[PDB]
Amino acid sequence: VEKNRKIVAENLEKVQAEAERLDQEEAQYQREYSEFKRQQLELDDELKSV
Amino acid sequence: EKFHYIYSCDLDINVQLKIGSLEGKREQKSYKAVLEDPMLKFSGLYQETCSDLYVTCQVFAEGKPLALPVRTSYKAFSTRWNWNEWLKLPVKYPDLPRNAQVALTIWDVYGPGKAVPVGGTTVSLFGKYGMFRQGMHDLKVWPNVEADGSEPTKTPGRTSSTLSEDQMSRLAKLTKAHRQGHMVKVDWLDRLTFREIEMINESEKRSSNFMYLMVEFRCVKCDDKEYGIVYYEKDGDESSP
Amino acid sequence: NKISQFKLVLLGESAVGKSSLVLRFVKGQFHEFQESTIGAAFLTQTVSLDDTTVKFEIWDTAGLERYHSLAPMYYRGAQAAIVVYDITNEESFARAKNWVKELQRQASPNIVIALSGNKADLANKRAVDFQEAQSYADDNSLLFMETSAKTSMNVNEIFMAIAKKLPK
Amino acid sequence: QSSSILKPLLQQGLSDAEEFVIVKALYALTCMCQLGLLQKPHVYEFASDIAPFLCHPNLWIRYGAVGFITVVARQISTADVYCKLMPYLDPIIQIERKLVLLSVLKEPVSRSIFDYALRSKDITSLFRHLHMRQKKRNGSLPDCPPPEDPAIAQLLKKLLSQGMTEEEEDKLLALKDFMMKSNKAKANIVDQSHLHDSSQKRIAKQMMENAEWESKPPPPGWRPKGLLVAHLHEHKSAVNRIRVSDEHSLFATCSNDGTVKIWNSQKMEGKTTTTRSILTYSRIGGRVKTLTFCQGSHYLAIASDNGAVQLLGIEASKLPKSPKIHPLQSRILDQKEDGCVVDMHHFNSGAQSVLAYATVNGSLVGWDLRSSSNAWTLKHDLKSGLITSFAVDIHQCWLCIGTSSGTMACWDMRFQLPISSHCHPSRARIRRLSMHPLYQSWVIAAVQGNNEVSMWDMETGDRRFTLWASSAPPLSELQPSPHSVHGIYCSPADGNPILLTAGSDMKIRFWDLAYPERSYVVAGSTSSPSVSYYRKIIEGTEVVQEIQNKQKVGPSDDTPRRGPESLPVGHHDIITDVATFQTTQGFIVTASRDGIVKVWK
Amino acid sequence: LERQKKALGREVALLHKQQIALQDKGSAFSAEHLKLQLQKESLNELRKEC
Ligand SMILES: Nc1nc2c(ncn2[C@@H]2O[C@H](COP(=O)(O)OP(=O)(O)OP(=O)(O)O)[C@@H](O)[C@H]2O)c(=O)[nH]1
Ligand SMILES: [Mg+2]
């Protein structure tokens, strides 16, 4: 029980550390993704000029 | 007029608030399971079993812990211990100092394999203009150490004023909703806009995952309006369309 | 044909089944895991009777007592209410009476009030006798049915009873 | 509360057994309900578990307690530890311990005070809650326990006490608990206690360098036919935007190039020369993105595609039909890496002056005009698309906005937030938005195809009216592209007129809130103008059948030419903007996409 | 108790987060490379030329 407890318990921290990590790059990717709207805006705007 | 405004020493009699529920830090189970902690190496031996906290509270003018402590009975933590007790101290309003502080702590109430859990908090009486009535309904945070939300002691809920910003915009609008502030519409469109405010409450609820709690109080006899017994010109703060 | 619109408010103690009742009526759905409502939810559904399409604008209120102070905003100008209790909970019925009282005192005098004795599928754990609830309903001109959002028993029927009583 | 006296009492000392006996009569006089009120005695008991005071008589009172203690909430569980002192005090402990162990054998064995944790059997707050509901019923409740001796174990007796009923718990799973745990004596002590229970029962910038004027609404305008009185142009380039001053209906216009083109309406009323030549110009030095007049002012605010924004003060003499001419940028506002999007400026009567413009990120940014500095910010979302129209409430309180995705979004400015969204199913990019008397309902100008207007009630979310040029009553998608692309003008006042461009037919229809049936259009048609504008119903909307006699339009080109030659006199591109002004009589301007204007009276 | 609560907590957090993450990343980036990288170019040609 003790060995496997330690093994099982401490790796949850490591697993969840990566889950928090996902939240970070996702925040960056959201800004990247937000620029898609900027590009869309520009295209739509000058297309409305067309 | 100030609803025919009258002084603090022109008041006379006891008080009766009310007291609701809380949003938890979740360190162990709702109600109780026997305290969840990986340092159980020693801690398991301490007979930690399922349990139930309670609390006690008194008051101090800091330097004298003046008030009578008073304890709590039982309600299921499935309710998040939502009491909505209406809760009273016979302390005549004139008997109350303008600078004084509440003192409350978690304790225990249902015979544990444990010793009765601490968990403090402290906060002030008066509003900015000194009237205790500024405190009437409110919210606060704290742990096994000790904290406040509206007037923070040193733990979860640790800064008071600037935290509310959009929530402070909600406080400014709460003063108008209280006054029935007359310069803007409150028709059924705005009634349904209050449906939208019911929505915004929940945003606050995410942020509430720290350690928050709900507090209440208001008068029996009404229309009436009052202030302190000494004077300063804060009433110069006034407005019109 | 003609369309008549009415604001309807759901009131009652938390967990009595207000959101379940309205989900059943609106969507023909029921979730064992229904989430407790925060604030109030807007829903709409119609019934048809006497060639009239009766469209309910429904405010499903959070029953939790902290939200009590918000209730008058949602029932102001409401032409119908359903006050819901849980038949397995006699205290939910005491709270239901106090909602009915508040409505008598503070709502529009014309309000058509329905009383729902919900969770009637759990009749073997009944705490509230049918005839007690009926006697209270009759005495106060409330439309009373025992309902079950779970099974759908009397769900459509209570909304139809309201529609019939409303001025059209 | 006030029965806490039970604790401090033990601080008074006496070793007279008589006192301990009066205390046994007091213990008899005291087995009490409140969860806390038991602990004052617990701790008196602690004094007594330091020093036992009355030997075997004490031992018997303790024995009486122990069987009741064989029932326990966890509220009782603190007393278990206290009770370990009573055996810890060697009475040959093990014989009395054995006798009592038989009397409370919830599990078979244990050891010292901490080792007291082991021999567990379950407490129950649950069935006791049911039992508190049953504080209502006693008698039969002492009659069912002896039958429970058989019903559990033996067969000595059976019961027919259904005369008392109360089946529901026995009918439910609550029946099970007695077989498992629940038993009679606890319930009799509890019944005693239940009887006890029963017994208890504004102008800081605007007056620095700007001038001032007051607004001038027309009379009801459904009555006049309009005859084309004048024709003119800003430049060949499309009109960047149009604005008409309240003062002298001073007419402001500009070329796409960023070159201004202004005129005096009273000069035109007099000299009549005004169509040939510009009254006033200004060098912007870049393409005009937007125009809006300063509310209550002669000043004019202009923004450029570089992000740069500025406010011109008017320098002019006051001589009849003869103003001196000079443009003067009085104040400047920053260009940025974020470019501009268009704006209207608002002095608020009994309240302050502010101007609001969208940034290139879509965000509304709302500057206090007097400060020439920001006062509020409201951020639009990539999901809505860009702004396709901008509108505001009468007191400015609710903003109303049409998106490039065919969603309508509103912002409570009183709360400084987007309130919510709606999106009429066809979800096309909104042309324009506006408000009418009966302010509760609002006009949306391009979602869906063959429909001219999807007028919808703001509180409802819903198209209370739907107007279509279609021969069929439902919205057959018979619209060419220009049917969805048009100018519109409405009045929340002034006898409730509405004017509407039909870009499919390139013409000005009229629709009078006073009479939809009698709505004589203001502008003509070459073939057949007359309109039987009769409203029908199909339940869900009060659909207006614009039965134009021989309109001659559909979703394809079934006529050889059908373009610029087919207009009431004054050939042109679609009416980009149409507006009413009232310098003497009421009269109207049509500004086309072609940098060209025609005036009607 | 340990095994249950950890099984409960880990499995839920993991499985939902795995599924939602795989989806939301997949979708957001695909949209860019399918559209940012395509629609924009298409409507640039019909902007500048046209
Ligand atoms: N057996 C049974 N369960 C029901 C019935 N109606 C609702 N429930 C359940 O009771 C619980 C609470 O139901 P809700 O609809 O969320 O209750 P509510 O009145 O809306 O509660 P609040 O939003 O907190 O005020 C959920 O688990 C529902 O699935 C019913 O008719 N029969
Ligand atoms: Mg609900």
Numbering used by the authors:
A (entry chain EEE): 201 to 250
B (entry chain BBB): 5 to 245
C (entry chain DDD): 16 to 183
D (entry chain CCC): 611 to 701, 707 to 816, 959 to 1358
E (entry chain AAA): 251 to 300
Quote the paper.
To improve the membrane recruitment, we made a construct (complex II–BATS) that has the C terminus of UVRAG deleted (residues 1–464 remaining) and replaced by the BATS domain of ATG14L (residues 413–492)21,36 which can still be activated by Rab5a–GTP. A total of 26,979 subtomograms contributed to the final average resulting in a reconstruction with an overall resolution of 9.8 Å. Thus, Rab5a–GTP is located in a pocket surrounded by the VPS15 SGD and WD40 domain, the UVRAG/Beclin 1 coiled-coil, and VPS34 C2HH insertion of the C2 domain. The C2HH interacts with both switches I and II, while the VPS15 WD40 domain interacts with Rab5a outside the switches. Instead, it appears that binding to Rab5a-decorated membranes releases the inhibitory contacts between VPS34 and VPS15. Interestingly, only the adaptor arm is solidly attached to the membrane while the catalytic arm is poised above the membrane. The BARA domain of Beclin 1 shows a protrusion towards the membrane, which is in direct contact with the lipid bilayer.
It phosphorylates phosphatidylinositol (PI) to generate PI3P, which controls a range of cellular processes by reversibly recruiting specific protein effectors to membranes. PI3P is generated by two complexes that both contain the lipid kinase VPS34: complex II on endosomes (VPS34/VPS15/Beclin 1/UVRAG), and complex I on autophagosomes (VPS34/VPS15/Beclin 1/ATG14L). Complexes I and II form a Y-shaped structure: a catalytic arm bearing the kinase domains of VPS34 and VPS15 at its tip and an adaptor arm with Beclin 1 and either UVRAG or ATG14L supporting the VPS15/VPS34 subunits.
